[PDB]
Ligand binder design. Sequence first.
Ligand SMILES: OC[C@H]1O[C@H](O[C@H]2[C@H](O)[C@@H](O)[C@@H](O)O[C@@H]2CO)[C@H](O)[C@@H](O)[C@@H]1O
Ligand SMILES: OC[C@H]1O[C@H](O[C@H]2[C@H](O)[C@@H](O)[C@@H](O)O[C@@H]2CO)[C@H](O)[C@@H](O)[C@@H]1O
Lengths: 437, 437
Amino acid sequence: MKIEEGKLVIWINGDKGYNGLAEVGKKFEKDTGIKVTVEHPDKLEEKFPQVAATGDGPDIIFWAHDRFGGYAQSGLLAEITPAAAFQDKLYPFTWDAVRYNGKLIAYPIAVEALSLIYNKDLLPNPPKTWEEIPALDKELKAKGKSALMFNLQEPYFTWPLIAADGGYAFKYAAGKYDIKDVGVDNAGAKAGLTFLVDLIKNKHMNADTDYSIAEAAFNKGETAMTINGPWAWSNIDTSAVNYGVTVLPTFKGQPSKPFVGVLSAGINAASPNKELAKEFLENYLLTDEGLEAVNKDKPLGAVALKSYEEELAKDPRIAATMENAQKGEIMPNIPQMSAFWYAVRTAVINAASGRQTVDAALAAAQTNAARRKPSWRERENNRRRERRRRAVAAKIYTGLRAQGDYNLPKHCDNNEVLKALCVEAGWVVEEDGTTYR
Amino acid sequence: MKIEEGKLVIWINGDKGYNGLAEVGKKFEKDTGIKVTVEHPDKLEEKFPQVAATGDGPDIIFWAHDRFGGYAQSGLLAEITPAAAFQDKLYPFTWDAVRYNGKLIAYPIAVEALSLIYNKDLLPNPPKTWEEIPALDKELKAKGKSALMFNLQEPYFTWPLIAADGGYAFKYAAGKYDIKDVGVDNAGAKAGLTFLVDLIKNKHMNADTDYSIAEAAFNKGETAMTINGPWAWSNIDTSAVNYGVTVLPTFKGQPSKPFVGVLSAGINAASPNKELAKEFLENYLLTDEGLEAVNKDKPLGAVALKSYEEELAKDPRIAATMENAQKGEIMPNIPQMSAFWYAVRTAVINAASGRQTVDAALAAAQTNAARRKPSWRERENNRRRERRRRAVAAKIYTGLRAQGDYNLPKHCDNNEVLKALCVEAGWVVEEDGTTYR
DNA sequence: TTTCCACGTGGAAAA
DNA sequence: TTTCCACGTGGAAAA
Ligand SMILES: OC[C@H]1O[C@H](O[C@H]2[C@H](O)[C@@H](O)[C@@H](O)O[C@@H]2CO)[C@H](O)[C@@H](O)[C@@H]1O
Ligand SMILES: OC[C@H]1O[C@H](O[C@H]2[C@H](O)[C@@H](O)[C@@H](O)O[C@@H]2CO)[C@H](O)[C@@H](O)[C@@H]1O
C-alpha cells in the first residue's frame, strides 16, 4: 500500500484498542474532512521496515519504543518536532524512550509493564515467589485446574524471570549501551530459564502455550494466574473472572524485572501527510478525550499524557503495573534490539521444547544477539566475488573445450574437461578425482 | 506438541466457533473424564503437514476438505471407519468430499459457500451483477461510503468471479481430475480477474484489503457489501448493521461460481486417542446438541448431519448459502490443491498490486498450479549429484596442490591452481580466464 | 526424464 | 577484516 495525500492510515498491534483509536480517527474526519483508517496487520513491526524502505507502509505506525531506533537508523521515520508547550504535556522519561541520537523519532503514548494477574476465587492469596508455584500447581491440579499459564512463544513474557537473578540484554555503562556486552548467558539468566524449563519438565506448564491459549485458559477460569499487560484487562472484565493485578513473584529472593515498553507512534518518513499526522497525534489522540476513547477499548497502561494519567493512576491496577515497572527497566531503542529479541525467542523456545539444553540455548543466544549484521555492500561484495570466480572458471573451460581437441564425449561436465587437461600435463586422475603424477 | 493418550487436542481455524467446540469438549470431559483442548493456531493448514510427518501435531484437525487429500497422500491421517448406521446420518455428498482413493479420511461437518452480504439500510436492493458495482460505488462515495469490500489476500474470495466466465482449477473428465489440465489462464479467468483489477484501478477497491479490514468496514457500516461465509454472521449480528445474505452477482450474465468447502475433521495418524477421537466426533460433535453448541458460536453453514440441517435449512441465510453452493462446485481434495491455491493467491495479489499484468500473473499461475512437486528422492538424487561433482573437483585440486610444485602463493583459490595446470599443458590464461594455446 | 552450471549466503580459516 | 569452497535447488538444455 501507499500513503496518499489527504488520507491517514495507521498500523497498531491487534492486542491494542484499535476500535477506540478508529473512533478518534472518526472525530478527526468530522472536524477536518481527512479520512483515517486504522489497521492491525500481523507482524507489523516486521512488515513496516520491509515496505517503508521503498516508500510504502502506513502514515503512522504504533509499537513499543524498542523497535524505533532501528527504523530511524534505516531512515524510515520522520523527525518529530513538537513545540515546547506540547512536550511539557508528557512525562520527560517517556520522551527519553523515543529519543535516538539526539532526535525525537516518535510520540510516546503509554507505559506498559507486565504484572501478575490472578483469579481471586481460585486463589485469594497469590504467591509471592516463583519457587512456591510448583506446589501450588499440584494442589490446583487435584481440583481440575492449573497454577499458571502465560505466553511462552514471545520472550517478552519470560524476560522478567530471566532478568530476576541477573540476566540482562545490553549492559549500560558510561551513558551508553554496549552492543557487544550481552547478559543472556550469565548465571542469573541460566537460573531463570532453568526454573522455567523445570516447570515444563515437571508438567506445570506446556512448552507450546502461546498468547491465545493462556488468555483463553485464564478467562475461562481454568488457570489461576497469568502474566500479561494492561491491554488484556478488558477481555477479563467481559469474562466471569474475579481477577487481581499485583507484583510479579520473586525469584531467588529478587524481584522479577520486566522490560518496560512505551507504546509510541512513529510517522512514516515517506508520508505526504506529516503535518496531518502531527495534528492528529498531538491534538486528537494525545488528549484526555482521545486517550480515553482508546483506553476504554483496551487499557493503555500509564499514559504519557500527564493530565489524563492523573486520573488513570487512581486505578490500583495501574499502581500495580507501575510497581512492576519500577522493578524493571526501560527497554533500549537501539537498532540491535531486534537481534536480541529474536535470539532470546529462539533460546526460550528451544530450551522449553528440549531441543537444546538451557546452557546451549543461551550460549547461542549470546553470540547471536551480539552478531553484527553484514551491510548491503558487504553482501554485494561477496555476491560479486563469487560471480567473478565462476565467470573466470567458465571462460577457462570454454577455451579448453574449443581448442583442447580432447577426446571428450558429446556431453560431459567440466570435471571431465579438467581430467583431460590433467592427463595432457602428465597426470593420472582416477574416477573419484584422486590425482597424481 | 505431541499427542498424549488419554487427552484430546483439537486444531480449528480462528474464524470458526472454537468456543462452542470447546463447550462440546467440556461435556465430553464430564461424561468420560477425558480432557479436550481446542486451539486455533495461525496457518494450521500449513503447520499440520510439517509437524504430523514426525508424529507431532494435534489429535484432530479441522479444515475444509480440499487440504485433506494431500494429508492422506503423506500418511498423516487415520482411515475413518464409521459404521454404515452412522454414515446414513450425513448427506452422501458430504462423505464424497472426504473420500480419497476409495477411503474416508475425515468426518464431514458442514458445507460452506460464499454469499453476497449487504447492508439493507444503505442498499435496499443489492446489485444483481458485478458490472453495476462501479456506478453503485460512485454513488456511495458521494455519501462517504463504498460499495464493496472483501478479502483480496485469499484467492478463495476472488475465485467465484474468476470462475464465472469459465475459469476452472482442474478439469474433470471420465471420473477423474486431470492435474495437467488447469484453467486459470483461459479467457474466462482473465475476464474475471481483469474486472477485479479494473475495480482497483478505478479506486472502487484497494489492493491491500484483507479479511479484518473488510469485516471491520462492513460491520461498522462504512461499506455496503461484503463477500463472506456463514462463520462471519455472528459478528455482524452483534454489530448495528441490518444485513441480508443473497446470491452473488453475475458476471457477463453468468453466476459467480464459488468453490464449495466441506469443513471436515481428520484424525492424526500418530494419535494414540483414535478411538476417543472417533467417540468425540461421532457421539458428541456430530449430534444436534453438539453442532448447535458450535453453530451458536459461529454459524457452521449447512451441516452434514441430516437431523440438525433440517432445522438450519429453515434459515433464509442458509438457503442463500446453498443457492450459491448449487452455482459453484465442490472443491477437489487432490494433493495438488495446495499448489493450485498458492499459484492463484500469488496471481491475484500480483495483478491487484500492478506488479504483474493479469495475463502475466495468470500465465505463471497456470504453470505453477500444474507443476509437479519433485519427490524427496528426486531432490536427494540432485543433492547427491552436485555433492559428488564438488567432491571429484576438490580431490583433483588437492592432488594438484600437493604434487604440482606449481610455485603458488601461500593462499590462492582453485582458479589459480587451474591456471598453473593450464600453462603446464602449454596454455595461456588471461586475467579473466580467456584461455588459448 | 536426467544432467549441468549458476546462484547468493554460510561458516571455516587466516590474518 | 577478507577469502574461499560448500551447500541444495533453479532453470536451461538435450533427449
Ligand atoms: O517478545 C518480544 C517482543 O517484546 C515486546 O513486544 C511486546 C509489546 O511491547 C507489547 O505491547 C505487547 O504487544 O506484547 C509484545 C510481546 O508479544 C517488544 O516491544 C518487541 O519488540 C519484541 O519483539
Ligand atoms: O484462499 C485459499 C484457501 O481457500 C479455502 O480456505 C477457506 C476455508 O475453506 C474457509 O473455511 C474460510 O476459513 O476461508 C478460507 C480462506 O481464507 C481452502 O479451504 C484453503 O485450503 C485455501 O488455502
